[PDB]
Structure 1
């Protein structure tokens, strides 16, 4: 299927795995990060004895399979799910073995050392891979953006990373990760819908309402004013049609769901909102480059697909920062895949072909030394 000896770019982002060959502009195999496990034991004869579903095979059946998240906040919980999702991506979709081409994986900023050593060991010992490389997502996203300056805000599913890069320079001391993202928003919407009257307590419905949020939920331009005008609703409340057919009616809750990002007090945490944390990060940077960080801020992550985030960011930053300079916020189209796109354009360089880590040196050095070599 592939006639070019190039690394397979597999972005294992929290919530959605995006795998594809280098050189492409979009991932071909896109599936959620979920593992479905047979709950009961059947006396039936003939069905697949497979004890571990994955991807679309699990999405197609969520009532029988208990759903487990292979990644939580960033820390890898179960490694069997890791081996399952890579083995599946290798021998069920791409139809190619890892013994013929490299593999450029993308990991989140500020992750545990155990996670890195574990994935590297599974990719070297178990699977025969000629060479591995771990890369931070923020750099590849800035590559795909086509710039060298700005602060990347990557909001995945269970973690949110703010990474400032000015003139290509990474700042490992300022990268601050906060576990507020799509899962805590799904939980907030679920508890407020339970307060509305429709109560559910199973994961399949949680994924359904997550999809409903992805499709409908947006960000408000003025929270309190929308609350007042929605008190007497007319066009502000919408009636959604569940894929099963049950008629759901959702009004203001939509534009109050992502608001939890701006007010973490809703989930009883002393952490500051994403905008205030980004602002504090800007103060932690130097003054000289702060204006450039204001003018080149970039966004990444699937959570940014909601309509109305750019305007909300502009008003909040204008209210926090002075209103004398110019603070333009740029969001490139299809930003979610941009990271992966970067991977593709990063795997075609010959120099990058010279910066890989082969098996033998890793085996003698050991995983810890490999950690030192990368950084």
Structure 2
């Protein structure tokens, strides 16, 4: 039958059936519990809400994110998220569908051990498999050679591949993601007097970040222009009728990706990370990786990130190379699209982990089979 492809992101959940062109159900990965006191009978029920029905009620809920930087911290909540996706979104009983999850590179082993343990023990899936996200992103584009940048809500990592032969000694992982951008935005917005303090208001700040932010091609010059003129201002309207206006915050926020010292981090931005990853491979294949620089992840949707990366990576490499950022319009869902492509290959059906093997080897087999 058709196997599920559930891409549990750090902030979003994508689910669907192998082969399709787009995820069937997409909903945020949060769980909210009421905090005030219910003074009425038979109303205000359901001690816990998940996804959209926790977004719409968020005003009176305290919203938790089960995953934290690509690591599942609250397993009791993650079981709930998976239950939601399997039953209330997809409307399937997973006991007849194989599954194909995803993980970030360099993620702690116990994370995926417990992942597969739950999948086999609670949901009784006949077989399943766990694939790194960079490999799926590289499938989606339909090629074999390139270096993936996959920047999501929890983790930003890079993975270079040459003709199907991975180079695990060049994979670099940098935990500066969309969540940290939103949490820095909440802090900088006070400079104007708009105090967002609650977990609910954090979703409002995420919405402002998605709607209005954009990466400056040249940070210093846009600083000067924005300070010297009001042509860069823009206004947002809160759910309660208020109106908030923001000026240079719009590009001050995404710039954290390229200058992690804005939030105290010591690393070098994503551009330097990619350059270092490419300069760690063999000398012959650096030329090809310079030319097939793939992008992915929702966080790479900031208008102008492709051009800023092009600039900041052409400034580094030798002047005789062709540095070519690939930025598909659907790069938000490239991981899932790659997963769906993968699961439908006939020659991949011998890479599943069958329930029979799990019943005979324990969860540790996930390492002896998967990547």
Residue in structure 1 matched with residue 38 of structure 2 by the alignment: 42
2:351–2:369 CA contact under 8 A, matched in 1: no
Q: TM-score, normalised by structure 1?
A: 0.95
Asked if the contact 2:293/2:323 (under 8 Å) is kept, the reply is no
Distance 1:359 1:212 in 2: 45
- What CA distance in whole angstroms lies between the structure 2 residues aligned with 1:139 and 1:257? 29
1:161 equivalent in structure 2: 157
Deviations 1:58-109 (A, max 9, x none): 1111121111111111221100111101111112111110011111111222
Structure 1 residues 211, 228: CA separation in 2 closer, same or farther (over 3 Å shift)? Answer: same
Instruction: State how far apart, in whole Å, the 2-side matches of 1:220 and 1:105 are.
Output: 35
Question: Residues 132-281 of structure 1: matches in 2 within 5 Å?
Answer: 132-281=128-277
SS of structure 1 residue aligned to 2:94 = coil
Report the Cα offset of residue 195 of structure 1: 1.8
Distance across 1 between alignment mates of 2:97 and 2:226? 56
Distance 1:305 1:332 in 2: 10
Contact 2:69 2:154 in 1 (8 A): yes
Give 1:179 deviation, angstroms. Answer: 0.9
CA distance in 2: counterparts of 1:32 and 1:54, whole angstroms: 8
SS of equivalent to 2:144: coil
Shift of 1:57: 0.9
Separation in structure 2 between the aligned mates of residue 25 and residue 141 of structure 1, nearest angstrom: 14
Q: Contact 2:116 / 2:366 at 8 angstroms: preserved in 1?
A: no
Name the CA distance, whole Å, in 2 between partners of 1:58 and 1:245.
Answer: 22
Residue 8 of structure 1: SS of its match in structure 2?
coil
Q: TM-score, normalised by structure 2?
A: 0.96
Q: Which runs of 5+ in 2 are unaligned?
A: none
Stretch of structure 1 that moved more, 94-103 or 319-328: 319-328
Q: Distance in 1 between matches of 2:172 and 2:240?
A: 41
Q: How many residue pairs are counted as aligned between the two chains?
A: 371
> Which deviates more, 40-49 or 297-306?
40-49
- Matched residues in 2 for 1:224 and 1:292: separation? 32
**1:329 counterpart = 2:325:** yes
Alpha-carbon displacement from aligned partner over 1:241-277 (angstroms, at most 9, x marks no partner): 2343211111111011111111111111221111111
Indicate the larger mover: 64-73 or 313-322.
313-322
Label 1:216 to 1:102 Cα distance change in 2 as closer, same or farther (>3 A). same
Instruction: Give CA-to-partner distance per residue, 1:155-185, whole Å, 9 cap, x none.
Output: 1112101111111221222212111011111
112, 124, 129: which one aligns with 1:128:
124
The whole-number CA distance in structure 2 between the counterparts of 1:97 and 1:113 is: 28
How many angstroms does 1:322 deviate by?
2.5
Cα gap change, 1:241 to 1:41, in 2 (>3 Å)? closer
- Identify which range, 365-374 or 224-233, moves more after superposition: 365-374
Task: Check conservation: 2:290, 2:324, Cα contact below 8 A.
Answer: yes
The Cα shift of 1:41 comes to: 4.1
Question: Post-superposition shift, 1:114?
Answer: 1.4
What do the CA deviations read for 1:102-148 (whole angstroms, capped 9, x no partner)? 11111222211111111111111122110011111111111111111
Q: Does 1:113 align with 2:109?
A: yes
